[PDB]
Design an enzyme around this catalytic site. Structure first.
Site, PDB file in Angstrom:
ATOM      1  N   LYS B 107       0.434 -35.591  11.231  1.00 14.98           N
ATOM      2  CA  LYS B 107      -0.309 -34.490  10.622  1.00 14.98           C
ATOM      3  C   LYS B 107      -1.542 -35.072   9.913  1.00 14.98           C
ATOM      4  CE  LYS B 107       3.566 -31.208  10.162  1.00 14.98           C
ATOM      5  NZ  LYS B 107       4.452 -31.918  11.130  1.00 14.98           N
ATOM      6  N   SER B 118       3.194 -42.697   7.310  1.00 16.03           N
ATOM      7  CA  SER B 118       3.469 -44.088   6.936  1.00 16.03           C
ATOM      8  C   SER B 118       4.408 -44.230   5.736  1.00 16.03           C
ATOM      9  CB  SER B 118       2.175 -44.864   6.697  1.00 16.03           C
ATOM     10  OG  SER B 118       1.469 -44.358   5.578  1.00 16.03           O
ATOM     11  N   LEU B 119       4.526 -43.182   4.925  1.00 13.88           N
ATOM     12  CA  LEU B 119       5.456 -43.210   3.794  1.00 13.88           C
ATOM     13  C   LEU B 119       6.877 -43.575   4.231  1.00 13.88           C
ATOM     14  CD1 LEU B 119       6.426 -42.626   0.829  1.00 13.88           C
ATOM     15  CD2 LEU B 119       6.437 -40.206   1.459  1.00 13.88           C
ATOM     16  N   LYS B 169      -4.039 -47.688  -2.842  1.00 12.22           N
ATOM     17  CA  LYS B 169      -4.016 -46.427  -3.584  1.00 12.22           C
ATOM     18  C   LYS B 169      -3.153 -46.521  -4.847  1.00 12.22           C
ATOM     19  CE  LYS B 169      -3.937 -41.445  -2.593  1.00 12.22           C
ATOM     20  NZ  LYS B 169      -5.347 -41.144  -2.217  1.00 12.22           N
ATOM     21  N   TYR B 229       8.131 -36.443  -8.554  1.00 11.19           N
ATOM     22  CA  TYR B 229       7.574 -37.661  -7.987  1.00 11.19           C
ATOM     23  C   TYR B 229       7.847 -38.901  -8.838  1.00 11.19           C
ATOM     24  CZ  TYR B 229       5.918 -35.750  -3.641  1.00 11.19           C
ATOM     25  OH  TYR B 229       5.880 -35.221  -2.370  1.00 11.19           O
ATOM     26  N   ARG B 231      10.880 -39.594 -10.168  1.00 12.93           N
ATOM     27  CA  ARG B 231      12.147 -40.139  -9.666  1.00 12.93           C
ATOM     28  C   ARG B 231      11.963 -40.799  -8.301  1.00 12.93           C
ATOM     29  NH1 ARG B 231      13.558 -38.058  -4.373  1.00 12.93           N
ATOM     30  NH2 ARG B 231      11.802 -36.570  -4.430  1.00 12.93           N
ATOM     31  N   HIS B 384      -0.727 -33.530  -6.161  1.00 10.80           N
ATOM     32  CA  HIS B 384       0.508 -32.767  -6.334  1.00 10.80           C
ATOM     33  C   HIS B 384       0.461 -31.849  -7.556  1.00 10.80           C
ATOM     34  CE1 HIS B 384       2.604 -34.490  -2.978  1.00 10.80           C
ATOM     35  NE2 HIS B 384       2.504 -35.725  -3.438  1.00 10.80           N
ATOM     36  N   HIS B 386      -0.364 -28.868 -10.232  1.00 10.57           N
ATOM     37  CA  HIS B 386      -0.559 -27.419 -10.164  1.00 10.57           C
ATOM     38  C   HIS B 386      -1.641 -26.966 -11.138  1.00 10.57           C
ATOM     39  CE1 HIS B 386       3.490 -26.569  -7.949  1.00 10.57           C
ATOM     40  NE2 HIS B 386       2.693 -27.406  -7.310  1.00 10.57           N
ATOM     41  N   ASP B 404       9.513 -22.213 -13.175  1.00 12.88           N
ATOM     42  CA  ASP B 404       8.398 -22.742 -12.409  1.00 12.88           C
ATOM     43  C   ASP B 404       8.841 -22.762 -10.944  1.00 12.88           C
ATOM     44  OD1 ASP B 404       6.075 -24.184 -11.503  1.00 12.88           O
ATOM     45  OD2 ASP B 404       6.067 -25.418 -13.310  1.00 12.88           O
ATOM     46  N   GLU B 638      36.393  -8.236 -18.197  1.00 14.67           N
ATOM     47  CA  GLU B 638      35.759  -6.911 -18.285  1.00 14.67           C
ATOM     48  C   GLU B 638      35.465  -6.492 -19.728  1.00 14.67           C
ATOM     49  OE1 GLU B 638      37.253  -3.974 -15.622  1.00 14.67           O
ATOM     50  OE2 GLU B 638      37.458  -5.408 -13.979  1.00 14.67           O
TER      51      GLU B 638
HETATM   52 ZN   LIG Z   1       4.254 -25.143 -10.438  1.00 14.88          ZN
END
Ligand SMILES: [Zn+2]
Ligand SMILES: [Zn+2]
Lengths: 704, 705
Positions: B107, B118-119, B169, B229, B231, B384, B386, B404, B638
Site C-alpha cells: 500500500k 516493512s514494519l 526515522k 503505540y 506499548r 497517528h 488526533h 474516545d 430485581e
Molecule cells: Zn481519538
C-alpha cells in the site's frame, strides 16, 4: 410454627449446622449484614405513592424481604432484635392497611393498595406471611390479632374474593394470587382461603392452583408463557407446593401429574444458554439462572430427588436457598457430590397435552461455549406472547448470534414508565418484523391480533437429533389469509469445518401476489457483503408505516438475483457468515439493511442492526440460508486465521414439493440437504437438480 | 550463544527450576504443545502474496514465533527436534529470500518483501534472530553460512541502508527497524550493524536508537504517539536494550537518561484502566496489559528493580515472559512477594523535554473500579495524532463512560482493507467532532492540517491531586484563527455522595461570531432527558457536510436556554447523570442527539450515540457541566435504588475572567467551584454571584457547603 416454607425441624437443623457449610454460611452472613444495615434506618413504612421502581415501591419491596429475613434469622439465631423489627414492621402495616384504597399511581393493570399493581401485592404477601409464620413464637395474642385483622386477612380478601378477574385467571398472575392467599390460609389456619386457592373461588376446580398445574404446563414441564415467565411463575408454583407438602402431605403435590413440578424445574434450567434464559416472548435479557425463584426451586427438587447434577447448577448460581432444603444442597456441595449437568437437544411440547406446537432446542458441541439453535414453533403464550411463529435464535461461543429482542422494558426504572412495559413493547417488540421470521405484506402474524393468535398453533412436522445432524420442521397455515409457510432448520456436522453450520429452508405459498420479508437480527460488526449497496444519499428514512416498520431506519438497499449472496460479521474472537439465496419466480429481490430507532422520541429502544431479505410481487418463495461460524481473531496476541467463509455458494431446487439444498465448499467438497416432508421412514424420493439426480429415504437426508 | 534476550546463564536457571513454578510451567508446556502441533504440519514457507491478516501474512507470523519458540525449547529441553525445525524453517527462508522483490500487495507504507509493509519484516527479524541465536552453536558451518548469507544479512541490509526513510526515522517504525538490525548485528558479531542501529546510517547520532530514546519519550517516560503505540514501541525499545545489556553492559543502557527505559515501562502500566490502554490518538480498544510487549518489559524491569508491586500487574496479565527475567517474576509470585500496584494520579509532560503540553490522569476512589479522568492536553503526536486538543475521557465502575473512538481499523482482518487504517480513520476518527472537545464552525482543530498541528501544543495552566479534589487546566490558543479556549476539569470528592463527580468548565473567546459545538460521547442507554426533543418527522439527515460531520446522523434537536439541563443514562448496574449549562450572550442554543453511520457504505464504523451542545452566533461561551455516577440497578435480584440524579441544578457566573460554578444538591447542600486562573497560591480572589460573595485563595477552590 414455622410450618410452611421452613418447618420447626428445619429451623433446628439449620441452627445446629449452618456455620459448618461454607456456601450456606456465606449466604446467611451476607443476608444478615444487609438486614442489619437496613434495620439501622429504623422502621420505615411509607404511604403508597410511587409507580414501579419508585421509592415507595422499592421500599415496600425492601420491607417484605426484611420481614421474611428477620423472621428466619429470629428462628435461627434466637436474637430478639429480629423478632422486634419484623413485629414492628408488620404492626406499622397493620395500622396503615385498613385505611388504604386503590394505589394513586395505578396503570391499566389491576391496581394494588401498597403497590401500583396487585401482582406485587401478592409477592409482598408470599414473603411477609413466611416472616409472620417464623415470628409467631415471640408474639403476644393481642399482637397476633392486630397483625391478622390489620394486614393479612384484609389483604387475602382483597387479592381473592375482591379480585375475581385475577384470582380465577389461568396465568402467572393467578399463580401468584393463589399462592399468596393459599399460604396465608395455611399459616392462619383458614381452611376457606386454602380451598379457594386450590380449586378456585367457586371450588369446582375450573380455576385455581390445580387447574393451573394441569393447563399452564405441558407434560414436559414447559410453561406456555415462555422461559422468562416460567422462571417467574416457578416461585409461587414451587412455594405453594412446599406449603401444601408441609401441611397436607396426603395431597402428594410433588407427585401430581407425573411429577410435573419436578419437571418444571428441570425444564427451566434447560431453557437457558450460558446461564441466561432464551429471551422469547416478553423477556429481559439479563435474567439468568441465579434468579431467586430457581435458587429456591432447585433446592426443593434436590431435597426430593437427590439428583447430584443439580449441584452443578447450584454452584453456577452462586446463591443458596436460606431454607432447610437449601441446607441439604450446601451440605452436598461441601461433600464433593457435584456431578455435571447434562445440556441436551430437546423437543418441548406446548399446550396442556403437548400438542399445540413445540419449542425445539438443538445443542451441538462440548462445554459451555457450544452451539445452540432454538426453533420457536410454539402456540401464542397469551398476552406476553410475540407474533413470531417459526422464529429462531442462534447461540455460539458463549454469545447470542442471531437474536430475539425480548421486551421493551426497563426493570424497576421509574423514569422509564414506572418500570412497566413501554408503548414500544406492543408497537415494536411483539411485532413480526422485529423477529427472524416471515412477514407478509408488512403485516404481523395474525395481523397482530392476540385473540386470533390464541386460537392457533404451528404444526410440528419433524424433530431429529443425531451425531450427523439435527432438524426441526414446522408448518404455519393460519398466520395470514391465503398464506401457508413451512420452515426447516438444521444443525449440520461437517467434519472438514471447524464448527457446525445452520441450514435454513423457509417455503411460502400465497394465493395472491405478495411482499415477503425475512429478517436476520445479528449480533456483531459487519466485515463485508458480497452484494453492492445503493448509495443512501445521506439520509435514512423510516422503513415502513405500520406494524413495527415505523421503528426501523433504512440504511441501505441492495439488489440481489439468482445467485447466492453473503454477509460476514465478527463477534469477539469468531467470524460468522450468512450465505443466502431465494428461489422465486419474481425478479424483485432486494436486501434491506436497517437500524432500530425510528419513532422512539423517549430513547426506549436499543441500537440494533438487521439484514432483511425482501421479495416483492410473489406468490411463492423458498428462502434458503447457511449460517457458518468460522475462524479465529485474537486481539491480545494479534493473530487471525480462517477469516474468510468456507462456503463458496448455496443452491436450491424444488421438485414436487421436495427441496434440495447444495452447499458448495471452497475446498471442492459439498453438503447436500434433502427434504421430502414425508414422515415415512422407508419412502424413497428423487429430485433432479438440473444435472445430477439426488436420491434419499425419509423426511430428511444430509450427505457430505 | 544464546546471548541476546536470553543468555546461557538464563537457560541454566530455567532448566534447573522451570518445572517448580506452576504458572511458568503451564505457559511453557502450552507453548511446547502448540509448537508440536505446528511442527506436525511440516515446514510451510509460502511465497509472499497477501496483505495484512491474509494467509501468507499470518503464516510468516506463525513462522517467526515458531523459530523463536523452537530455539528457546531446544535450549531448555535439549530436544534436537526443536533445533531441526528452527533450522529447516530458516533454510527454507534462506532459499527463497534472495529472489524476493517488493511485496505484490503493498500500500502507501514502505513495502516489505515477506510482508506488505516493512514494519512486519522488522518484527519477523526481531523474533527470528532470537531463534537463530539459540540454535547457532548446534549447526554445521555450511548451514550457518547459508542462513546468514541467504536471509539475515540481506534482510538487515534491506531494512537499513536500502531503507533510509524508515531506518533514520524518529518514529515507532524506526524503533522496530533499528532493533531488528541491531539485534542481528549482535548475534552475527557484525559491528557495523550495531553501530548504525545505535547511531543512524551515517553514524553521527542524528538518527538511530540513542536519538529515539532522547526524542520519543518525555522525561517521565511518556511516548509521544500515545498509549497504544507506546506499548507497541516498548518491545523493540526494551528488547534492543536487553540485547545491548547482555552484549555490551558497559553502555549502561538501562541507566541511560535517568533510567528512561524503566520509566517507560511504569508509564505504560499507568496509561491503562481496568487493564486496557486509554484509546487516545490512533488506538484499538481491545488492547490491554497482557499484550506481549508489556509482559516481556515488565519481567525485564522486575529483574532490574526487584519492585514487588510489578508482581501485582504480572498476575493481572495472566501471562508470563518465557525468559530468564520471567522466571524471576514466577519465582517471586510463588514466594508470596506480591504487593499492590500503586495506581495514582499523574501529570505526564509531552515532548522530549516534557514542556509540550501534558497528559493528565486523575484517579479517585478505592479498588480496581475507581473513577479515572484523562485530560488530553498533549502535543499532536505526529501522524497517528488526533485533532482533539483538550479532549477528555472518563472511566468508572470498570467501564468506559465518556469515550474516545480510537482508530477506524480492524486488526489483521484482510477483508477490512488488509487490516490497515481505513478511509474513515482520517475522515471520522481523527476529526474534532468525533471527540469530547470544542469544535468551531464545524471545522477541526488546526483545520485538520497535520503540518500546522505539529507546530503547536496546549499550555498547561494547573495540575492538582488531593483527597478533596483533582484538577487539570489547560489553554489552547492556536487551534483556530482568532479563537482561544481554556478547559478546566475536576474530580470532586463530595462526602454526602456515593461517588466522585466530574466538574467541567470550557471557556471560549472568538474574534468573530461563530458556531461552538461540544460533544459528549457516552456509553450506555438513555433513561431520560430534561429537555423536550423536536419531532424528527421519521427522517435522519446527515448532520453536516465536512470534517467528520458527514458521518453523523441527526436523530433529534432540542432547544435549551439559561437554566441547566440533564441527561441520565444507565450502564450495567450504575446510572450516570450529565448536568449542563452554557453561559453565552447568544440565545441560539440547542442540544443535538446524533448517531454514527452516515457516509459508511462499507460498514466500517460502529454504532455510537452522542450528545452535542451547540451555540450559534457567539463570540463568547462558557460550557459548564457535571458528570455524576449514582444509584444501583440489579437485574438479577430485581432491585433499584438512587436512580434519580442528586444534582438539582448547575449555575455559573463569571466576573473579571474568574469563574464560579455552583452545583445545587437535592439534600440542600451545594458544591462551589471557583477558578481564578492565577497560579499565585497566596492571591485572594472575589466574585459576586448576585449579592452572594465568593472568596478564595489561589488558582482553584472547591468547597462543600
Ligand atoms: Zn481519538
Ligand atoms: Zn420476541
Amino acid at each position: 410454627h414455622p410450618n410452611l416454607i421452613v418447618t420447626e425441624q428445619d429451623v433446628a437443623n439449620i441452627a445446629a449446622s449452618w456455620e459448618s457449610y461454607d456456601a450456606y454460611a456465606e449466604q446467611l452472613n451476607a443476608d444478615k449484614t444487609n438486614l442489619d444495615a437496613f434495620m439501622a434506618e429504623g422502621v420505615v413504612v411509607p404511604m403508597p405513592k410511587d409507580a414501579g421502581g419508585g421509592y415507595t415501591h422499592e421500599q415496600h419491596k425492601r420491607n417484605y424481604k426484611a420481614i421474611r429475613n428477620a423472621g428466619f434469622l429470629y428462628q435461627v439465631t434466637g436474637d430478639e432484635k429480629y423478632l422486634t423489627f419484623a413485629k414492628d414492621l408488620l404492626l406499622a402495616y397493620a395500622k396503615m392497611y385498613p385505611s388504604l384504597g386503590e394505589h394513586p399511581n395505578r396503570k391499566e393493570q389491576s391496581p394494588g393498595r401498597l403497590f401500583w399493581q396487585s401482582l406485587n401485592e401478592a409477592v409482598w404477601l408470599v414473603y411477609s406471611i413466611q416472616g409472620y409464620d417464623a415470628i409467631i413464637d415471640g408474639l403476644a395474642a393481642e399482637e397476633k390479632q392486630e397483625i391478622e385483622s390489620g394486614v393479612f386477612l384484609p389483604m387475602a380478601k382483597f387479592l381473592s374474593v375482591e379480585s375475581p378477574e385475577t384470582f380465577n385467571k389461568i396465568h402467572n398472575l393467578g399463580t401468584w394470587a393463589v399462592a399468596a392467599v393459599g399460604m396465608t390460609g395455611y399459616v392462619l389456619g383458614n381452611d376457606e382461603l386454602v380451598e379457594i386457592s386450590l380449586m378456585g373461588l367457586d371450588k369446582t376446580g375450573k380455576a385455581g392452583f390445580m387447574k393451573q398445574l394441569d393447563k399452564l404446563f405441558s407434560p414436559d414441564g414447559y410453561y406456555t408463557e415462555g422461559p422468562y415467565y416460567q422462571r417467574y411463575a416457578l416461585m409461587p408454583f414451587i412455594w405453594f407446593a412446599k406449603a401444601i407438602e408441609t401441611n397436607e402431605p396426603e395431597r402428594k403435590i410433588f407427585e401430581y401429574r407425573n411429577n410435573i413440578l419436578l419437571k418444571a424445574v428441570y425444564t427451566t434450567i434447560d431453557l437457558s444458554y450460558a446461564g441466561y434464559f432464551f429471551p422469547i416472548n416478553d423477556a429481559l435479557k439479563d435474567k439468568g439462572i441465579d434468579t431467586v425463584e430457581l435458587v429456591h426451586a432447585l433446592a426443593i427438587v434436590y431435597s426430593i430427588t437427590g439428583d447430584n447434577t443439580l449441584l452443578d447448577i447450584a454452584q453456577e448460581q452462586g446463591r443458596i436457598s436460606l431454607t432447610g432444603d437449601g441446607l441439604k444442597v450446601a451440605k452436598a456441595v461441601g461433600e464433593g457430590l457435584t456431578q455435571p449437568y447434562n445440556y441436551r437437544s430437546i423437543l418441548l411440547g406446548d399446550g396442556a397435552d403437548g400438542d399445540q406446537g413445540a419449542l425445539s432446542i438443538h445443542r451441538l458441541g462440548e462445554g459451555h461455549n457450544h452451539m445452540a439453535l432454538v426453533a420457536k414453533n410454539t402456540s401464542q403464550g397469551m398476552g406476553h406472547g410475540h407474533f413470531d411463529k417459526l422464529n429462531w435464535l442462534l447461540y455460539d461461543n458463549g454469545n447470542e448470534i442471531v437474536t430475539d429482542y425480548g421486551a421493551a422494558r426497563y426493570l424497576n426504572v421509574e423514569a422509564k414508565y414506572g418500570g412497566h412495559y413501554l408503548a414500544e413493547n406492543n408497537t415494536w417488540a411483539k411485532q413480526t418484523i422485529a423477529h427472524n421470521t416471515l412477514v407478509v405484506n408488512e403485516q404481523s402474524h395474525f395481523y397482530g391480533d392476540v385473540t386470533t393468535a390464541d386460537l392457533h398453533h404451528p404444526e410440528v412436522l419433524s424433530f431429529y437429533s443425531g451425531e450427523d445432524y439435527q432438524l426441526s420442521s414446522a408448518k404455519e397455515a393460519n398466520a395470514y389469509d391465503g398464506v401457508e409457510f413451512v420452515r426447516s432448520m438444521l444443525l449440520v456436522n461437517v467434519p472438514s469445518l471447524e464448527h457446525p453450520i445452520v441450514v435454513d429452508v423457509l417455503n411460502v405459498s400465497a394465493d395472491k401476489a405478495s411482499t415477503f420479508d425475512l429478517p436476520l437480527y445479528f449480533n456483531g460488526q459487519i466485515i463485508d457483503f458480497s452484494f453492492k449497496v445503493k448509495d443512501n444519499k445521506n439520509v435514512m428514512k423510516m422503513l415502513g408505516k405500520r406494524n413495527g416498520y415505523q421503528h426501523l431506519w433504512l440504511r441501505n438497499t441492495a439488489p440481489v438475483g439468482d445467485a447466492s449472496e453473503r454477509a460476514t460479521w465478527i463477534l469477539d474472537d469468531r467470524f460468522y457468515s450468512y450465505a443466502f439465496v431465494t428461489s422465486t419466480p419474481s425478479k424483485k429481490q432486494n436486501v434491506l439493511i436497517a437500524e432500530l430507532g425510528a419513532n422512539d422520541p423517549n430513547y426506549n429502544l436499543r441500537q440494533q442492526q438487521v439484514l432483511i431479505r425482501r421479495v416483492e410481487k410473489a406468490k411463492q418463495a423458498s428462502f434458503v440460508s447457511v449460517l457458518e461460524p468460522h475462524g479465529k481473531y485474537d486481539g491480545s496476541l494479534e493473530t487471525t486465521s480462517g477469516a474468510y467463509s468456507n462456503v463458496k455458494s448455496v443452491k436450491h431446487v424444488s421438485e414436487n414439493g421436495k427441496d434440495v439444498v447444495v452447499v458448495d465448499l471452497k475446498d471442492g467438497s459439498n453438503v447436500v440437504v434433502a427434504l421430502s416432508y414425508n414422515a415415512n421412514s422407508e419412502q424413497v424420493h428423487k429430485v433432479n437438480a438440473g444435472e445430477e439426480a439426488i436420491e434419499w429415504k425419509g423426511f430428511s437426508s444430509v450427505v457430505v
